[PDB]
Ligand binder design. Structure first.
Ligand SMILES: N=C(NO)NCC[C@H](N)C(=O)O
Ligand SMILES: N=C(NO)NCC[C@H](N)C(=O)O
Ligand SMILES: N=C(NO)NCC[C@H](N)C(=O)O
Ligand SMILES: [Mn+2]
Ligand SMILES: [Mn+2]
Ligand SMILES: [Mn+2]
Ligand SMILES: [Mn+2]
Ligand SMILES: [Mn+2]
Ligand SMILES: [Mn+2]
Lengths: 310, 310, 310
């Protein structure tokens, strides 16, 4: 029962700065102590200096390839994350990555599928993060990771991303909590027949059924390893206010956590990313505390924490 | 695919002024652009000058018939709405009416049932709005429309309402989200055996089942046209604060919208009223924005807007 | 149809003062008028002077037996409550007790099971309140009542509690809404196989199923009398802010009340405690009003109040 808590304080995949503070905030909230308390032999893994990267992002506004903003910087860092996560798994340890915007998952998923190529992927998010380099309207790379992992729009993808291994198929990715999908993404998900459960399915079937369906969609043989990339903005902003791109009509705090327990209960989770926590994007001390403690809550629940006897 | 957005800035059916501003606010929120974006060939239909009517209401406190307040004024305006909506339907266009307090539905429903006499009616509301002229304690006519449409207490109903055609039967009206019913109304609904789904059924069966049940109750042959008069105060005030008579324990924002999609999904909606939006009844700019954007949201969702590919 | 509204303004079972104001606040909110309106022939029953007891608690910091704080004082008062409730039932009247912290339930449950020894007990709470005298970390007796009623840790229980009759078995107590259980309590509930439904079951099955399950667990023959000790802190603090130990992820206002109706609908409720309302533990006038009116709401709903015709 060994765990490596991968710190990924990156913010180049999007406009607002502050999300790179996630790792620190989470850790000071007692994340590592919590994993220990859950019986996890933990050790931190730093991939790069958070402030050094902020400097390179704040200045170099010349790092672009079309509407895509900061592709080189995002490629460099996500590659270091990929390599890091890859080793962590080769060592037979569970990698829990703390972001940082969601573009880090390009490194995480790439790293996990490198050791567990048959792993399914549950993308808990309000967004589909599948925009292509050519299609991305905003150009914020945190909304493009999946397109890159899937190898879509191969032609218009640059050199700085050639390091990205092609190991993720459409039938191994399942969304949950979607409600802010771009027209381009709606078509893509439909073209590729990606299993996506929007808030509509949650309202229709309740979180339980959805989770069940989500897990089945990426787990054919019922034995496959499961990975969850958890974007906190999936949860209604009235619970998670400190986040870059909030959208109303999100999961309730109870659903956000129940979802984790169902997964833990699955007994096949091999990795977890907890992203989009931006402390500087709050109004009070409770805005940040509620947000960060929610992050730690997803971690404890995913890692086995239950409300009753265990 | 033709639509007429009927503007009904009336506030005589109740105490608070400001609800007649609904139409304008909605429209500036981009309501018509939204219907266009949904592929609806739209055109506005003005029934009367909003400020002119406010003047006649503010002054003439002598317009009463018992406890009933402003019956003449309400009759005059709701008649113009009736006629308007009637023509809009005769033209084969979908009428989307924006209020204005709920007393306008006397004109809307009367207008719709004039062209589609077999249309069922789903009343999404926290209130039953079925009080009689004689029974109404408050005297606020926005809580009496259904009694008039149903022809109840025929004897004590005045001359100014003789224009109201009798075309609505008890078996063609179904409530959803009820939680603030008057004793008089509880008896009536029971006497007439009106299908009413209070918050109790939502909590008990969940919004999906309720919607299904609500649609079946007014649609025997499974082919009948469906009309929905949507009172925004059905939604919990923590979502829709700017409304005249809010009651706690309402539908969540997610339920409010999911309900619409289920209906749209029904493929038989022939008309829709979106009422009780009172901008001046807020505390902040978000109170109004949240309320008005919620109004536009019900419109988009009812008219086909989905979270995923369509 | 006779009812005795037992006033129990006690606060010795916990740190914060103000919760003894519950009874008064509730009553001024019209609690008794409400029970009358529901057709209940009511009469108040005062057990002791609320301010006199506050004086004895504020001063005597020497009243302890280990980590347990104020055992003598709690024993004296809960005994008076026991006796009171016992008589109220012997008189064939329904006892509705208003607290006051949850340690009063030692008197209430003891009183009810004295006249209805086969009565099941539904503990609506975020906490299990089953800590032992020896195990209690906090020492706040409001989290120990059930251990005393169950006769657990008999050896380390003091003289001042010998008056407590042993009439409650593990198979006659069922929790609902649990989410803040201590490690000690988790073991106990598991050892004794106590039917406990945490927020996890609510999220998983919805409030309806849970209530059904909760009622079945304590009602084998399907004829047994039912008692509910209702801790308002079971409801999410965003609904019930004025309470001593709030925990996020609670029941929604709708669930809090729906739960009551299901019970009322059961037709076998023989007693009800409504506890933990601390007016002085608010920030605004709405904090207190919302809290206290919620208390009265649970009362009306439990006692038969429905949203539709009855
Ligand atoms: N934060 C996210 N996703 O996680 N926002 C993505 C927003 C938008 N879809 C884009 O392409 O930029
Ligand atoms: N706003 C509404 N209904 O839509 N309130 C109705 C209130 C009350 N039932 C009455 O007769 O006036
Ligand atoms: N308010 C309550 N329960 O109702 N809190 C109990 C807290 C804690 N379990 C204890 O032993 O003190
Ligand atoms: Mn994301
Ligand atoms: Mn997102
Ligand atoms: Mn209405
Ligand atoms: Mn209403
Ligand atoms: Mn308690
Ligand atoms: Mn409690």
């Amino acid at each position: 029962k060994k765990m490596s808590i991968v710190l990924a304080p990156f913010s180049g995949g999007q406009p607002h700065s502050g999300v790179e503070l996630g790792p620190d905030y989470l850790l000071k909230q007692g994340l590592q102590q919590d994993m220990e308390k859950l019986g996890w032999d933990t050790r931190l893994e730093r991939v790069f200096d958070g402030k050094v990267v902020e400097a390179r992002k704040a200045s170099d506004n010349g790092d672009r390839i079309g509407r895509v903003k900061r592709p080189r910087l995002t490629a460099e860092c996500t590659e270091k994350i990929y390599k890091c996560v890859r080793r962590v798994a080769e060592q037979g340890r569970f990698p829990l990555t703390i972001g940082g915007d969601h573009s880090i998952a390009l490194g995480t998923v790439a790293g996990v599928l490198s050791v567990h190529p048959d792993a399914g992927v549950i993308w808990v998010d309000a967004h589909a993060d599948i925009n292509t380099m050519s299609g991305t309207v905003s150009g914020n790379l945190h909304g493009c990771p999946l397109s890159i992992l899937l190898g879509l729009d191969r032609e218009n993808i640059p050199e700085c991303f050639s390091w990205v291994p092609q190991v993720l198929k459409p039938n191994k990715i399942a969304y949950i909590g979607l409600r802010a999908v771009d027209d381009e993404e709606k078509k893509i998900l439909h073209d590729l027949n990606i299993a996506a459960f929007s808030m509509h399915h949650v309202d229709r079937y309740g979180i339980d059924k959805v989770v069940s369906m989500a897990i089945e969609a990426v787990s054919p043989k019922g034995t496959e390893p499961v990975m969850v990339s958890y974007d906190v903005d999936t949860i209604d902003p009235l619970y998670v206010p400190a986040t870059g791109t909030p959208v109303r009509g999100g999961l309730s705090f109870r659903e956000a956590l129940f979802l984790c327990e169902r997964i833990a209960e699955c007994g096949r989770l091999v990795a977890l990313d907890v992203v989009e926590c931006n402390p500087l994007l709050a109004a009070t001390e409770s805005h940040v505390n509620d947000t960060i403690s929610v992050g730690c809550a997803i971690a404890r629940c995913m890692m086995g924490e239950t409300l009753l006897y265990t």
